Ligand binder design. Sequence first.
Ligand SMILES: Nc1ncnc2c1ncn2[C@@H]1O[C@H](COP(=O)(O)O)[C@@H](O)[C@H]1O
Ligand SMILES: Nc1ncnc2c1ncn2[C@@H]1O[C@H](COP(=O)(O)O)[C@@H](O)[C@H]1O
Ligand SMILES: [Zn+2]
Ligand SMILES: [Zn+2]
Lengths: 199, 199
Amino acid sequence: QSFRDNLKVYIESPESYKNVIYYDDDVVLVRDMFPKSKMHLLLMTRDPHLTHVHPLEIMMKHRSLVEKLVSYVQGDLSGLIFDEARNCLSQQLTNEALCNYIKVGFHAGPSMNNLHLHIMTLDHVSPSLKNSAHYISFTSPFFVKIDTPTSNLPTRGTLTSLFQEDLKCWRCGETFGRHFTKLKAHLQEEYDDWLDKSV
Amino acid sequence: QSFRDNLKVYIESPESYKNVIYYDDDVVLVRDMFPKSKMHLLLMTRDPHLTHVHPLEIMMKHRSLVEKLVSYVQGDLSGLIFDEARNCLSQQLTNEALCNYIKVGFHAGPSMNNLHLHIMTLDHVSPSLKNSAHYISFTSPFFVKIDTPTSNLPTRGTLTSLFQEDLKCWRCGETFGRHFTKLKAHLQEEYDDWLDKSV
DNA sequence: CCCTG
DNA sequence: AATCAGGG
DNA sequence: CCCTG
DNA sequence: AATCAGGG
Ligand SMILES: Nc1ncnc2c1ncn2[C@@H]1O[C@H](COP(=O)(O)O)[C@@H](O)[C@H]1O
Ligand SMILES: Nc1ncnc2c1ncn2[C@@H]1O[C@H](COP(=O)(O)O)[C@@H](O)[C@H]1O
Ligand SMILES: [Zn+2]
Ligand SMILES: [Zn+2]
């Protein structure tokens, strides 16, 4: 009905989309249409019950889905993911370098209704990263890493006013107040530095 | 030294500026470079002491200057002013129509340092009127009309937070919140209505 | 979610 | 250039 | 004051 | 599109 159901077509009809880089009966790996890092993918369950379950509920009470998703990411999709990353970053990056530069998690408050796990590089260098909320949502407790212990899931209390905070580089700790454009330029430098040291 | 002395050249060297439409030893009438109404003029004293006196002090303690300025506006400059107005609005407007559509006053807090009296039409239809503070500064107590009794001069207390208020049409009382662009379009309509009824 | 004003 | 309402 | 970002 | 910091 609304924009919030936009991801639905990927799990209904993955055979129709070239940016669906993997599908089977259970899951779909699709490119993020508005990548917030050089590589940004979404792993979606095709299970019609679970797809509408809130990610925090998934983390709390659906561990078997959580384990399955992790199995895909470390297993049958790992080669695929490393290749996407090498194409998006550099061919000269090894699996080990890439593995330490990739994060996997749910947003604590999704906008899209179909459950989707973000798998993305750490750089946050991207034209689609256009505002502070974008950046903060992937670099704060709002981003719930897939290996978060259940007792440490973020709470309504801990998330309060999170998008209003000063901008901080995830890599070196430097602060930028609310100067989003300054952060952007800094992220670019951080990426060039990391790339040059990693190739 | 700064932009705040920009009006100075008009009283030093009125002979150098075609937009100085009147000068003598005592005063200068010059077009406002950024008119906030269809007609917007500035009347400046050439007296080197008084030019730097704050307008509220002028109103309180320099009545003879106040009376002289008013004498110019109603006397030797009246024909000149009506012609400027007819050229800026419409040739079909009589002195009487124009007289009731013109206001004369000081800003309570000037940005320019050389004392200048605003003489302008009421329309506030102008490309140079670009923000709410512009509009409010000419349509609130911040605009100190030249015939304000001294006991009713605005105070620091009365001016507080004035530029943060909702926008109100000076002619019909309609409110626009902070929708400046909506006010603009409305002012245009108000002007067409007034013009059509006045010609 | 995004875009536009 | 950062912040925000409206609409899809 | 204005303009630009 | 409204609000604001910086600079001239
Ligand atoms: N039509 C689309 N196709 C693919 N990805 C999308 C589409 N629309 C939005 N997205 C992404 O979906 C993600 C939703 O994240 P969330 O904030 O967790 O709901 C964001 O990263 C968006 O860039
Ligand atoms: N260089 C200039 N020449 C003529 N008028 C100007 C110039 N710069 C600014 N102004 C006007 O000077 C006025 C100053 O008003 P105030 O806010 O009372 O200081 C405003 O109406 C400006 O548009
Ligand atoms: Zn950094
Ligand atoms: Zn009105």
